[PDB]
Write a protein that binds this ligand. Structure first.
Ligand SMILES: Nc1nc(O)c2[nH]nnc2n1
Ligand SMILES: Nc1nc(O)c2[nH]nnc2n1
Ligand SMILES: [Zn+2]
Ligand SMILES: [Zn+2]
Lengths: 187, 183
């Protein structure tokens, strides 16, 4: 009777508490905490958050819930964008009288999320890990169009990538190190 | 609807029914015909003119169905394909419809997928995509497919997703032209 993806407690918490982060690094810092927490709550090493671009108010956060949620569409970007839309009560994050919105993401978007970003109404995309980083640990980005960044820019969506990339990469390599069946107390 | 503790996209009555009534449609045109019934039911339930369904490829057991619920669900990701693929996964208790021991799954869709849905198809585990209306047909009533890679069809086929296109296209267009005429 519904499409229903449950949020683990830490994500409910993130989505409940008012929070304002002005600097790109502050915003991405927070998104990287959610990655760490999502991995500790049985999810993939990806998180994202929709902010008010100009005030830094957090609207909504998401994390990859593919396995726990039994749903291949539950990438961090889909959850973040959709929960932001559900909170603001509109399918269009650029609807009249909404502030401009920004998707802050732990990694460059896959081809699915790329499309979702375009349809979402956000005006800004801010990424940490690059596509090659993500692919290096076996997560596929899929076939995006050529010059997909230019693609976004031409729809009025500004793209920045590499923001706190080093910390992001460190979280990716930590996930990979502990993504295996032999028990490892250190994980 | 908005929820503290879930992303929750509710389904209108016809779609709750479609997802619970037993239905075996062996021939592909029987599959696409039923999907076009869902398109019409969706328009009457304030949705866009798009529907899709996951079938077991060989038997044509219907596993799940989705329709575009963008405006009434306040969700730009709620295309037909996303809901159909996600409800099937929910129904089969797995995020991968090609998981060992599941029969091969097929997504039958009213129109060729947009770039988002193209991506969702690849990650879903379906082994087959069957489309009615073409990309052109969708753009001609003002729906945007977005920037898909050159040769999106070959991209699907290259990872073992067979693509059929044009099936009951004229029937699907009749519904599209009606939707566009009635704004
Ligand atoms: N490539 C990729 N893979 C996943 O599993 C994701 N989850 N959130 N962003 C994602 N990106
Ligand atoms: N382009 C496009 N747009 C929508 O709103 C859809 N819903 N289901 N397939 C869809 N395809
Ligand atoms: Zn993605
Ligand atoms: Zn789509």
């Amino acid at each position: 009777d519904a499409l229903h993806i449950g949020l683990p407690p830490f994500l409910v918490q993130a989505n409940n508490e008012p929070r304002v982060l002005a600097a790109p690094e502050a915003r991405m810092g927070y998104v990287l905490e959610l990655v760490r927490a999502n991995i500790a709550a049985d999810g993939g090493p990806f998180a994202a958050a929709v902010f008010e671009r100009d005030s830094g108010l957090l609207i909504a956060a998401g994390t990859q819930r593919v396995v726990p949620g039994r749903c291949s569409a539950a990438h961090a970007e889909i959850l973040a964008l959709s929960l932001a839309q559900a909170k603001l009560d509109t399918h269009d994050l650029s609807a009249d009288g909404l502030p401009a919105c920004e998707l802050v993401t732990s990694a460059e978007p896959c081809v699915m999320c790329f499309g979702a970003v375009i349809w979402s109404g956000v005006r800004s995309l801010v990424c940490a890990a690059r596509s090659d980083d993500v692919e290096a640990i076996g997560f596929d980005e899929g076939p995006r169009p050529e010059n997909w960044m230019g693609g976004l820019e031409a729809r009025g969506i500004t793209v920045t990538t590499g923001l706190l990339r080093d910390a992001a990469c460190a979280l990716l390599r930590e996930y990979n190190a502990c993504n295996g069946v032999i028990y490892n107390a250190r994980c």
